[PDB]
Design a binder for this molecule. Sequence first.
Ligand code: MG
Ligand code: MG
Ligand code: MG
Ligand code: MG
Ligand code: MG
Lengths: 15, 15, 15, 443, 443
Amino acid sequence: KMLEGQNAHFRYKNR
Amino acid sequence: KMLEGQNAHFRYKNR
Amino acid sequence: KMLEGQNAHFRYKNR
Amino acid sequence: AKYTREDIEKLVKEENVKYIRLQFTDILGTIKNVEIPVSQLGKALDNKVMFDGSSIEGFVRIEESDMYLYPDLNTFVIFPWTAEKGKVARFICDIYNPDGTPFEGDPRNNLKRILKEMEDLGFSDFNLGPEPEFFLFKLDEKGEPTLELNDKGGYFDLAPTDLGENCRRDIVLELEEMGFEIEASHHEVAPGQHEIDFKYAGAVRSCDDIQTFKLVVKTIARKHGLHATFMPKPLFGVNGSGMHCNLSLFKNGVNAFFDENADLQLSETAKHFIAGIVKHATSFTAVTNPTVNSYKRLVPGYEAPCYVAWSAQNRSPLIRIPASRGISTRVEVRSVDPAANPYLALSVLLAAGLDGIKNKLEAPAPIDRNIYVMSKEERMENGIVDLPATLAEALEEFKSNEVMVKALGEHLFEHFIEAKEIEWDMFRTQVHPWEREQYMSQY
Amino acid sequence: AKYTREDIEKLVKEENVKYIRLQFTDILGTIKNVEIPVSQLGKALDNKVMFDGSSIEGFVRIEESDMYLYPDLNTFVIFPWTAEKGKVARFICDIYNPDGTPFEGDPRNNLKRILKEMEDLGFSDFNLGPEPEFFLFKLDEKGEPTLELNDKGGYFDLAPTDLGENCRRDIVLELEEMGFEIEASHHEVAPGQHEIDFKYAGAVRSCDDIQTFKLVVKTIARKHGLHATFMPKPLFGVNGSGMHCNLSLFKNGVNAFFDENADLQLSETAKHFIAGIVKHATSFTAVTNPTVNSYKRLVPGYEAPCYVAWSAQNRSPLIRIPASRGISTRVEVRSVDPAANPYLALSVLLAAGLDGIKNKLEAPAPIDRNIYVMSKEERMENGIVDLPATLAEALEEFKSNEVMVKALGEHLFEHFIEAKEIEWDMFRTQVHPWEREQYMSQY
Ligand SMILES: [Mg+2]
Ligand SMILES: [Mg+2]
Ligand SMILES: [Mg+2]
Ligand SMILES: [Mg+2]
Ligand SMILES: [Mg+2]
């Protein structure tokens, strides 16, 4: 669950 | 080891 | 040698 | 104190400011802020403006977490490149639990927290006096950074003349008006790597200035259409940018490290700072060197340290002891770099240093003979241990170390660690282009 | 002095000064500076400023070392150009070890050190009328220099393009605005070559007003649209810019080289200075013609001194006693080039000059005409010897001479060698395009 949006929440934070 | 960095040091100087 | 420099004088004037 | 309230309201009115940023720094150094119209200033200075607290944990944040926002009345600073709709100004604000307690996990407070131990320990002021180096790239038409240096300069050279250039000027002189105090400056070792230096100040007042600085460079560097970048070792095989840190523990308006009557004129006290710091050298490395790139900056040679040892005359050492004494006797720590969160680097540097003065440790013996002529296995025979090789080989040392875990609280130590293995882990599961220039044609 | 601490400031004040460049000169002769805002003028002139002195030793530095920069109050100037959020001044400085003693490593001090050598002996004044040529290459649409020459004019010619015609003018009328006592300008032989000839002065005032000179000649050269290259032999095929130095010892406040009733109105003292100068000639070339290119300048013809003999009349003599006597008597060392160090140069010459003076040395035969017309073997037997040919055949001859050590002192010396040695060796291992035109397709 949260790990896919956070997984996204993070992808842009780290690009 | 100072030959890598002095070596970069001289790569800035001599270019 | 001047014949060189003299030669290295003349290339300037006669152009 | 410096400015009282009626002093701030006197300038908001007179100088006429229409907007107010309420700055605070997070866990990864990004300088963040909530923004209020000058119309709200009252409520702010009464310490009542609130925000989502979790914004500090950075990306690893998880729950809305209401926090209040106390403005350090003194930090107030009006920017000059602003006009147009009124001016702009900023109060660096400490953080406070919704029941008025400091927020344990805010970098800035944690420093006031550790310098509490410091005044609980007999000392009066723990002075930082930084040397933040940097790089400048030439923007592209699409207004985007490039791999193009703004100049082909070198060490202390007469970087880009009085004619047209010298962003250093616009950069320097600008900082003048804003109330700064610039030691000097000079073009650094690599093409377009410049360096500005201020005067010393208590950690609080200083790390606040490294932040403000980084703003004013980045934003002045842009007016000139050039990218600025404090990144650690931007190019491969070109001088890394470092944030030399100058520490001076005073006590009684008097420099404690001083002791004319002694050896090197270093106070026994100063030996305690220097020794204690050599212990956790590799432990707090992760912090002062918080990024993945710092380690491509930590390669032997480019003048960047690697080995834990101290002296006053040796190439690339970890701790340097500058030559001038009296009030200026200070233990320079050269492994730090601009990437590093000021408040977090100080917390770990001081605490690691304040360990040595309360368990009275013993300096190991300075290395003047040299380590860069020795081999890794030879230096190992003495107190010389290499620094880590990665943000990862480092994290295993910052975790292991029970004292750093006392500089950063159960909160900040957790989320710093939380965040840097997602960082490191983001960078190790990638498949960079070198990996193609190596393994696609051969294999 | 000509300015006193109160003189300066006030001048600063009325001149809304905001940026000060405390500038110096390294071992490679490239003009360095640490730059402060006028707000630090005070700490400046209280000789309380500091810097990393290992930045004088060129690229061969090893361990950053804190030096003090005392500014010579007389070498103060306010650049006409800068003024753009204030005006931009400067000062030339002496470099001090931490303990109030000079830096035996300063090219400027080393010189006030060898001049101190002089007064010991009885003389007071060493003076330098210099002859510095410089090309002017047209710049293109990107702003970078191209190999196009500014004009086609010859030796002393008239109007040749307004880019030189009014560059040697804009420089000259400009150079005047900064207390320059400039004698006469004229165009020099090789297309583009220029010469500004300025009134003689004290060695220190001289190599100073010289460094000054390049900064300036390169700005007003660039403001006009071209590159002003001081390179020895920028172009093969053509003449080179050379920096003749006119020597003259005084003492009592009278010319020492002038001698009313003697051989060529040349005082004995003159013949020693002339005889000695001839001795070390092939030793101090290293310093005087300090670059790989220098020796491509010393080729047959193109007026360059290729051998080592003195004459008051010859194609290419290594010294030269010019016409005039009176106060004017003086020695011309045509050998030197603009590349050389204004400081280390003076240093070596003035030391092989004095050698010949403290030791009573016999000057060899004034060479009249038989030489150039001569051959390189019968030319041996005569007090005449070739001058090196490569910056290495040059280094060797310099390490072997124990008075050039004493001249530069172990620190400039040792580091200077270690450096050129690397300069040379960078040039050597490199496969030049020449090697390929000739050897690529033939063999
Ligand atoms: Mg306690
Ligand atoms: Mg530095
Ligand atoms: Mg430093
Ligand atoms: Mg003990
Ligand atoms: Mg001439």
